[PDB]
UniProtKB/Swiss-Prot annotation:
The chain holds residues 5 to 758 of 1300 of the full protein. The keyword Isomerase does not apply. Belongs to the DEAD box helicase family. DEAH subfamily. ATP binds at G96, E97, T98, G99, S100, G101, K102, T103. Its EC number is 3.6.4.13. It is an enzyme of class 3 (hydrolase). Keywords: ATP-binding, Helicase, Hydrolase, Nucleotide-binding. The gene is hrpA. This is ATP-dependent RNA helicase HrpA.
Length: 754
């Protein structure tokens, strides 16, 4: 026997990863024990604990199943190169076309190497549904049960069973586990799936794993994506190998059917194109059709029209994000007839619906993009990229001859960008900092991004988060921390400026008005102004203009839209959007944003008022998001002075262009020919001080003794970003700065004034 520290140190390699450091720190410290035989007594008893820990590993190895790979998958051919690539390299990139076996067979290859035993095999998906279904598919193929070696994790802590070897999860779950597992010791291997989608979660995970490699040499990383730019991921991990895999896809015929303006209605021509496409495909075969839609409200309207057509032996089923257990399994089930599945772009990330023969691609998706001309994070309905359009097309390459109908010209298609911009380059950096600080990812400049955002916008995002009171601005030692308000901002799906207004609406019982206005400002203005019908449309939109705030016009329009869809049918309401020069798709998207926002507001415990709020309550809440968008009008000129000594004028289309008040707040500042203030509202300067306690700068002048007061009085000036919200008010200086009053009293310079 005669156990040693050196010999026991070697035994730690037979332990689970998350156990090694616990026994290392204890072995380092037995040297403090003075009695050399009392050391051996501690060694013998620690060797018993290490016996128990090492037996844990031997039990997991015995419980591992025989790994089998199904035939007909093209990835099992490159299984050789894949296996030894992960065996010999810390990082491996595996790019493969849709339907190659990639996703379900990669964790099997890792288990074949002997991983998943001393630490989990983590496998991330962008959406929660994709994680659950992938887990079930691997377990089925391995003949294991739910609760066996294959598990899944959502719902941030309902953690998987002890039998689990391969843990599937969402990428937001893994990021959440960083806070308490900083080194990710729970895992032997980490697989980032669908990386090409390149969201914030994806790029945050690829950055953190770059920082983790020098600290986790026992860790293996596999990045798997589509054929979209595999070099990018390789270049990031010090040029890690790439293994291309082929897809089995059947050839897909593409038919270009552009929209022809005949009904004088953009929406009627859209749905008549949807109708003519299903009608075209109906002549080929009664194969199931998948229709990509812009938003969940358009899905409702389109499924409505399709059903009222009563196509024979067709089952028109919609897909919303509100799909529950009882509703998500229906698309993965057998059907006696034809299925017409209307889905959003979610049918490209996670939804991989089976039995899809045809596809109808309108070619438009809602995408989160930061505006440069103005600033707000917006959600424009944009034409998708070629790579996005091809993934929509690739969703029917499993039957003999699929057909994809694109509702646009080939010339349109070939003119779009090849690839979609990464979200890190599309997002307001204030929002990126909010998430990074909430997750603990550190400084935005120190972070090793796969594609770093522009450094200049960094200090602007920091100032915005300070303006909104979202970050500490306290010298902790040197770092950033979220305030309780800033943590709430990170959860709302609108811009930080807009989110700050909703949070302040709680104090003023105007959350409804705030959500209406905030969601309106998140999209391109739904009120259209055709160049052939300028005067007609102007007459229509004047029905909602307010004399003091054209923020409230959004509220008047919302109430109008809400009352009309009560009395009107689906068809009649889409007809009303044409007669009122309202963009139907953006009216529906407006309603979509409001619904998503309303749900986050409710799960924040924030109540929504049922009774309308008045001017003051609304615009004070708006003001807290527009503190650097305040304007003080010049005496004679009709121009304003802005925050940073800037100077702007009211937009000519504004309701305040006729009568510009002394103090305004503007939603956006744009520079076309002069500095312009778009959507604007009269305010009171008295409102600014109570909501700007973190920005106000107080100066004092004319300090003098006053007999009547028995104290030193002065004149106080309060500025927010240099604007004089409080020009001059008499204060009791003796209660503010008694030191200066003394310094001034012994200079013989006090003598009483007024």
């Amino acid at each position: 026997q005669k156990l040693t520290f050196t010999a026991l140190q070697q035994r730690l390699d037979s332990l689970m990863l998350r156990d090694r450091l616990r026994f290392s720190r204890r072995l380092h410290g037995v040297k403090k024990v003075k009695n050399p035989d009392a050391q051996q007594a501690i060694f013998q008893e620690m060797a018993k604990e290490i016996d128990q820990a090492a037996g844990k590993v031997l039990l997991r190895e015995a419980a591992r199943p025989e790994i089998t790979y199904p035939d007909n998958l093209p990835v099992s051919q490159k299984k050789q190169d894949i296996l030894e690539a992960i065996r010999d390299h810390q990082v491996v990139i595996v790019a493969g076309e849709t339907g190659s076996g990639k996703t379900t067979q990669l964790p099997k290859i890792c288990m074949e190497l002997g991983r998943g035993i001393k630490g989990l095999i983590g496998h991330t998906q962008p959406r929660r549904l994709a994680a659950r279904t992938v887990a079930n598919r691997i377990a089925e193929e391995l003949k294991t049960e739910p609760g066996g070696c294959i598990g899944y994790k959502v719902r941030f802590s309902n953690h998987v069973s002890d039998n689990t070897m391969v843990k599937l999860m969402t990428d937001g779950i893994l990021l959440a586990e960083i806070q308490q597992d900083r080194l990710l010791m729970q895992y032997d291997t980490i697989i980032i799936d669908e990386a090409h989608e390149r969201s914030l979660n994806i790029d945050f995970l690829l950055g953190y794993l770059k920082e983790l490699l020098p600290r986790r040499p026992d860790l293996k990383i596999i990045i798997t994506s589509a054929t979209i730019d595999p070099e990018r991921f390789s270049r990031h991990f010090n040029n890690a190998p790439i293994i291309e895999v082929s897809g089995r896809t059947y050839p897909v015929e593409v038919r270009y059917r552009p929209i022809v303006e005949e009904a004088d209605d953009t929406e009627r021509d859209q749905l008549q194109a949807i109708f003519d496409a299903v009608d075209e495909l109906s002549q080929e075969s009664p194969g199931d059709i998948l229709i990509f839609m812009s938003g969940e409200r358009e899905i409702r309207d389109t499924a409505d029209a399709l059903n009222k057509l009563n196509l024979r032996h067709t089952e028109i089923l919609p897909l919303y994000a509100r799909l529950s257990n009882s509703e998500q399994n229906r698309v993965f089930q057998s059907h006696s007839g034809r299925r017409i599945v209307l889905a959003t772009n979610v049918a490209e990330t996670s939804l991989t619906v089976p039995g899809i023969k045809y596809v109808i691609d309108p070619g438009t998706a809602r995408i989160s993009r930061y505006s440069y001309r103005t600033k707000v994070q917006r959600l424009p309905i944009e034409p998708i990229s070629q790579a996005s359009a091809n993934q929509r097309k690739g969703r029917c390459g499993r039957v003999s001859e699929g057909i994809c109908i694109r509702l646009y010209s080939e010339d349109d298609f070939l003119s779009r960008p090849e690839f979609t911009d990464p979200e890190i380059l599309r997002t307001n950096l204030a929002s990126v900092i909010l998430q990074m600080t909430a997750l603990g990812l550190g400084d935005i400049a120190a972070f090793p991004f796969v594609e770093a955002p522009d450094k200049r916008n960094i200090q602007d995002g920091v100032r915005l988060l300070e303006e909104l009171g979202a970050i500490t601005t306290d010298e902790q030692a040197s770092a950033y921390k979220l305030t309780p308000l800033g943590r709430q901002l990170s959860q709302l799906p609108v811009d930080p400026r807009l989110a700050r207004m909703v949070l302040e609406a709680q104090k003023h019982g105007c959350v409804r008005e705030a959500m209406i206005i905030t969601s309106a400002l998140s999209i391109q203005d739904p009120r259209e102004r055709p160049m052939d019908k300028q005067q007609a449309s102007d007459e229509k939109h004047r029905r909602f203009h307010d004399k003091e705030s054209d923020f409230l016009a959004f509220v008047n329009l919302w109430n109008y839209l809400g009352e009309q869809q009560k009395a009107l049918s689906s068809n009649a309401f889409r007809r009303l959007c044409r007669t009122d020069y309202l963009n139907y798709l953006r009216v529906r998207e407006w309603q979509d944003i409001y619904t998503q926002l309303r749900q986050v507001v409710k799960e924040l415990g924030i109540p929504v008022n049922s009774e309308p709020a008045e001017y003051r309550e609304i615009h004070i809440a708006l003001l807290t998001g527009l503190l650097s968008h305040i304007g003080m009008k010049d005496a004679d000129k009709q121009e304003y002075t802005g925050a940073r000594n800037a100077r702007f004028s009211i937009f000519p289309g504004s309701g305040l262009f006729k009568k510009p008040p002394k103090w305004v707040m503007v939603a956006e500042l744009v520079e076309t020919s002069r500095l312009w203030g778009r959507i604007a509202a009269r305010i009171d300067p008295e409102w600014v001080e109570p909501v700007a306690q973190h920005l106000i700068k107080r100066t004092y002048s004319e300090p003098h003794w006053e007999r009547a007061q028995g104290a030193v009085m002065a004149t106080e000036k309060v500025t927010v970003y240099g604007l004089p919200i409080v020009a001059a008010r008499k204060v009791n200086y003796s209660q503010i700065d008694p030191a200066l009053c003394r310094e001034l009293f012994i200079r013989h310079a006090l003598v009483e004034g007024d």
